[PDB]
Symmetry: none
Subunit: 335 residues, 4 copies
C-alpha cells in the first residue's frame, strides 16, 4: 500500500539559450503507485501536475503542503481512484515562474513540458505511451499551463483539469485598473524584484515582469528583456498595442475560436474556481471561459464551489474532484 | 441487499378545480433502501425525481427504462451512494405534461409537488424532515420542474439536479423560428393531439398547447383553455405580448436576479446537457443559464457531455453523476452536538 | 489567578426610536481580574474593546477567537500587564454594524458607548471613575469607533489604540474605484443583504448600506432609509455631494484640524496596520492619519508591522503591543 | 548580578589620511553582561550605540549621564531585557563630530563603524556573528549614523533605532532660514569654533562646518577643507548647487527609493522625536521620514512622545522603548534544526 516519490534531475534542452541564467537541467518528482514493484509488467496512465506562480513542485510534494505521496497512497488504498503515475515538474525560473510558455528570453518552457519532460518520464518509468492515457492539471499558473498545453497538444494529453487558472484573459486585476501596472512600468532594475514578494503589490509587479518575459520578450530592452503590454503617457496607463496583441494571442479565452477542432479532440476538460476567489481576473475569466466553450458546444465541466478562496480548498478539490476526473477519463488499459 | 419499490395512489387536492379532467388522486412510486425493515430507528434523506414531457414515472421505474429499483439496489450495495429514499411522482396531464407549474386551467401542480407530495411521503415513510436532507431532480420537463421548485422552495429542497432541462428561456425551437407554431395556432380540437406524437411537428404541437395551459391559461377560451404566446397576422407569426410576457415570467433564466437570495440558499445546483441535444432551445439556454449564474457568482456545477442526445445517456448520467451528487450534497445524519456548536458564529 | 468573564444585558436608552428594530437593551461582556474577590476594596482602570463589522463581542470572548478571559488571566499572572477590567460591548445592528455612531435611523450608538455603557459599568463594577483610568480600543469598525470616541470624548477616555481601523478616510477601495458601489446603488430591497455576506462584494454592499445608515441616514428613502455618498448618472458612478460631505465630516482623517486641542488632551494614541493589509483604504489612510497627526506635532505612536494581514496577527498585537500600551498609559492609582 | 564596562583603544585604519589630525586609534566602551564569566560557551547579540554631535561615548557611560552599566545591570536583573553586549564608540572629531560618514577630509567614519569596529568587537568578545543578532542605535547625529549605517549595511545590522535623528533632510533650521548660515560663511579660522558652543548660533556654526567636512569636503580649500552648500551673493544666501546636491545625496529621507530593497531586509526600524524638539529640521523631517516609509509600505515604528526636548528624556526612551526594542528584534540564540527546516519554502 506504500507508493514512492522519486526526485531526479533531468535534461531540459528546450531551455538552452535562455537569457536568464536558468539551467538546462531541471528537477522533477514522480509518484509511483504501491504495485509498481510487486507488479513488474503493469503499465500506468500518467498525470502531470503543474504548480503556480512563485511556487515549485514542493506545492505538491511537501508534507507541509499537499503531501501528494500520502494523498495518493490513501486514495488508491481506499479504492477511490485507480493507480496512476503522478509527475510534478518544476516550472520556476529567474522571474519566479515561466508560465509553461515558449519564449526567446525564458526558454522553450512549453516544449520542456510536452517534449523534454514527457519523453523523459516515458523512457524511464512504466507509463502507457498514448495520449488517451496522459492527463495534465495545474493550479493558478499551473492551470494556465495545463489548458494551453492541452489545447496545443491534444495528441499528447487527452484530459485537462484547471484549478482556478490564472491569465485566461484580460479582465479585472490584470488590466490597467490594477494600480500595480504603473509601478511596474517604472521599475529600474532586477534588484527591486529579486526578493520573494512581501505584499500583493510586489506579487503583481513580479508576475507582470514574468508574464512579459514569457509573452512579449525583448532581446534588447532593459533591465528585464521585456516589452510591457501597457505604457505610461502623461501619467496615465494605456495599451502598448504590439505587445498587447501578443498577450491576447497567448491567452486561452481568446484562443477557443482558433483551436476548436483540436479542443474537440480532448476526452475531458474541467475548470473550477472558488466563490471567494480573491483575484478578480480569475473569478471573471473562468466563467467567461466556460461560456466561450458552451457557445461553441464543446463538451466540458465547470464548477464554482461555495466558500473557496484561491487556495483554501485545493486539497478538497484534489480529493473529491480532480483525481476522480482522471480516473474516469484516462484509459487504464495497455494495448 | 434488496430495496423495495412501492406504488400507491395519494391525495392530490392541489389539482382540485382543474379544467382538463385530471384526477385529484395521483399515483407515485417510492424506493425504500434495503435496511428499511431491520433498522426501525433509521430515517433517510429523500430524492424527488421528475419525469419529462409525454413521460410518466415509468421512465424511472420500468425494467426496460431506468429500472430505478435495480439501479439503487446496486449503487447502494457497491458503496457508490448512501441509502436514500427515492420518490418518483406522476406529473402527466391531459396535454401529456403539466410542467410542475401552478395554473388555473391545469391545477396547482407546483403545490402538488412541494406540499401534497412531500407532506404525504414524510407522513408515511421514515424520512429526515429537513431541507438539508431533501433533494429534487428531473429530466427535460422534469429538469424545468426541479429547478423552479428548488428556486421557489429552498426551505424545502436544498439540492437540485437538472438533466437537459426544457423551458429555461425563449430561444431556438421555442420561438417563431419553429414552423410548428403556425400549425399550432390553427389547431381545432383536442382530437388532433390525442395520439402519441410520432413526428417532430406533432411533438411540438402537443407541447405548445401543454405549455400554454401551464404558463398562459385562459379559462374562457375553448377549445384548449389557453392563450398562445404568439399570434398570426397576414400569415406571419408575431408575439402575443401579454401571454409572451407570462411565459418569460415562468422561465428560470429570467428569474435569477429576483430569486438570487433563495438560489443562494441551495447547497447544490447542477445542470447538464448532451453535446447532441436535438432541441435547440435546451442547447442554447442551458449554456445561458450557467453563464447567468456565473455572472452573479452563484455556486453551481455545469456539464456539456460528449455524445449525448436528449434521451440516450440518461442511465449513464444517473449512474455516474446524479445519484452521487445527492449522496454528496444531502445530509444523511442529523447534526451532532459539536456540529451545532461549530456552526455557531464566533466573531 | 483565575479571573471571570460576566455576560449581562444592560439598558441602551440611547438607541430608543431607531427605525431598524434594534433593541434598547444590549448585551456586554466584562472581564474582572483574579484579585476582584480577594481584594474587595481595590479599584481598577477599565479598557473598552470594540469589535469590527459583521462581528459581535464574541470576537473577543469566544474560546475559538481571542479568548480574552484566558489571555487576560495569563497576561496578568505573568506580570506583563497590571490588572484592569475589560469591557467588550456588542455594537452589532440590523445592518450588521452601527460603526459606534449617532444616527437618526440606527440610534445614538456613540452615546450608547460613552454614556449608557460607561455609566452602567461604573455603577456596577469597581472601576476608577477618571478619564485618566479609562482606555478604548478596537479592530476595524472598532478602530474607527475607538478613535472617534476618544477624539470626541477626551474627558471620558484618555488613551486609544486602533488596530487596522476602517473608514479613516475616502481612499482606495472606499471610493468609486470599488465596483461594489455601482451594485450597491442598484439594491432594491433588504432581503438582498439579509444573509451573512458570502463574498467580498457582498461584504462591501452590506458595509456600504450600514455606513450610509450611520453617516447619511434618510428617514424617508427606501428601502434602507439611507442616502448614498455616490450616485449613478449615465452608468458612471459620481459623488452625491450633500451625502458625501456628511461622510467626510464623520471621518477622522479630516477631523484632526478641527479636533486638535481635544486630541492633545489624550494621554496616549496608537494606530497600527499590517504590511499585508488587504483593504486598500486601510493601508492608505492609516499612514495618512499618522502623517496628519505628525504635521500637527500631536504625540502618538504608529506602526506598520511585517507580514500582518487584516486579521492574522491581531492576537500577537494584543499580547505584545495593545495591552502593554494601556498598562503604561492608564493611571492605576485611586484618589 | 553585575556586568562590566570595558574601555579600550582600538585600531581605526579607516581614518588614515584624514586632514584634521584625528587619530587612527580610537577608544570604545563595551558592556559585558553579568553571566559573561560563568557561561564560557555563551555568545551574545550586540547593540552598537552612537552618541550625538559635540558628544562622546560619555553620554552613555558616565554615571551622571545615561550610566549604561548600571542601566543594563538593572534592565537585565529585572527581566525587562535579555543579556546583550553593548558597544559605545567615540565618533567625535576635530569639528566635534564626523556624522559616521565617509569623507576624504574627515576619514572613512562609516567604514570605521561597520568594518573596523564590528570586526574588532567580534574578534575580542563572545558575540553572535550574524546580522540577525546585531543592532545599531543612536541619538541625533548618532541617529543619523544608525539609520544610514543600517540602510547601507543590512547584511551587518538587522535592527535600527534612531532617537531624534539629525540630518534626515533639508528643512527648517538646516536651510537658509537659519540666520546662522550667513555668519558661518564668513568664518575665518578654526580658532573661532574651538571652544565648546555656548549659544545657539555657536552650535550651528560649529555644526555646519562639521557637516560640510562630512558631506561636501574640499581637499584644497583652506581654512576648513569644506565646500558649503550655500553661498553669499550681494548679502543674500543662495544655494551652492554642487555642494547642495552632495548634502541631499547623504540624507536618508531622499534615499528611500534607492535603498528600498536593503531597507526591507531590516527586521526592525524605529524612529522617535520629542514633542518639544528645539531643532525644527528634526521635528519636520522625522515626520516626513515616517511618511516616506509608509508611502512605500515599509514596516517600521514611529513615535512623537509628549514633553520631550532634544535631550531631556533620553534616559526614559532607553528604559521604556529602545532597549526593549532590541530585546524583541534581535535573535538571542542560533536557529535550531526545526527553525531551519521551518524557514524553508514549502510551495
Amino acid at each position: 500500500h506504500a507508493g514512492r516519490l522519486i526526485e531526479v534531475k533531468i535534461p531540459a534542452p528546450s531551455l538552452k539559450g535562455n537569457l536568464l541564467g536558468d539551467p538546462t537541467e531541471q528537477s522533477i518528482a514522480v509518484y509511483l503507485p504501491a504495485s509498481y514493484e510487486s507488479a513488474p509488467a503493469k503499465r500506468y496512465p500518467t498525470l502531470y501536475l503543474l504548480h503556480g506562480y512563485t511556487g515549485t513542485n514542493k506545492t505538491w510534494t511537501s508534507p507541509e503542503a499537499m503531501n501528494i505521496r500520502a494523498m495518493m497512497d490513501e486514495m488508491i488504498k481506499s479504492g477511490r481512484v485507480q493507480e496512476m503515475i503522478v509527475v510534478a515538474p518544476n516550472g520556476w525560473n529567474a522571474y519566479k515562474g515561466a508560465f509553461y510558455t515558449n519564449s526567446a528570453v525564458t526558454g522553450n518552457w512549453e516544449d520542456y513540458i510536452y517534449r523534454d519532460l514527457v519523453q523523459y518520464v516515458d523512457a524511464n518509468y512504466r507509463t502507457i505511451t498514448r495520449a488517451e492515457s496522459r492527463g495534465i492539471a495545474g493550479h493558478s499558473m499551473g492551470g494556465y499551463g495545463a489548458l494551453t498545453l492541452a489545447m496545443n497538444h491534444a495528441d499528447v494529453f487527452s484530459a485537462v483539469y484547471a484549478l482556478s487558472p490564472c491569465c485566461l484573459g484580460m479582465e479585472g486585476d490584470f488590466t490597467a485598473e490594477n494600480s500595480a501596472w504603473l509601478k511596474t512600468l517604472r521599475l529600474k532594475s532586477k534588484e527591486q524584484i529579486s526578493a520573494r514578494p512581501r505584499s500583493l503589490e510586489e506579487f503583481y509587479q513580479n508576475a507582470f515582469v514574468a508574464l512579459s518575459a514569457a509573452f512579449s520578450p525583448n532581446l534588447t530592452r532593459a533591465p528585464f528583456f521585456v516589452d510591457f503590454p501597457y505604457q505610461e503617457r502623461d501619467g496615465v496607463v494605456e495599451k502598448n498595442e504590439p505587445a498587447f496583441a501578443k498577450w491576447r494571442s497567448k491567452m486561452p479565452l481568446y484562443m477557443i475560436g482558433e483551436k476548436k477542432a483540436d479542443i474537440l479532440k480532448l476526452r475531458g476538460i474541467a475548470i473550477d474556481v472558488g466563490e471567494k476567489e480573491e483575484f478578480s481576473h480569475i473569478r471573471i475569466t473562468t466563467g467567461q471561459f466556460s461560456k466561450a466553450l458552451s457557445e461553441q458546444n464543446i463538451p466540458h465541466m465547470f464548477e464554482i464551489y461555495q466558500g473557496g478562496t484561491h487556495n483554501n480548498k485545493v486539497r478538497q478539490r484534489l480529493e473529491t474532484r480532480l483525481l476522480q476526473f482522471f480516473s474516469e477519463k484516462l484509459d487504464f488499459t495497455n494495448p
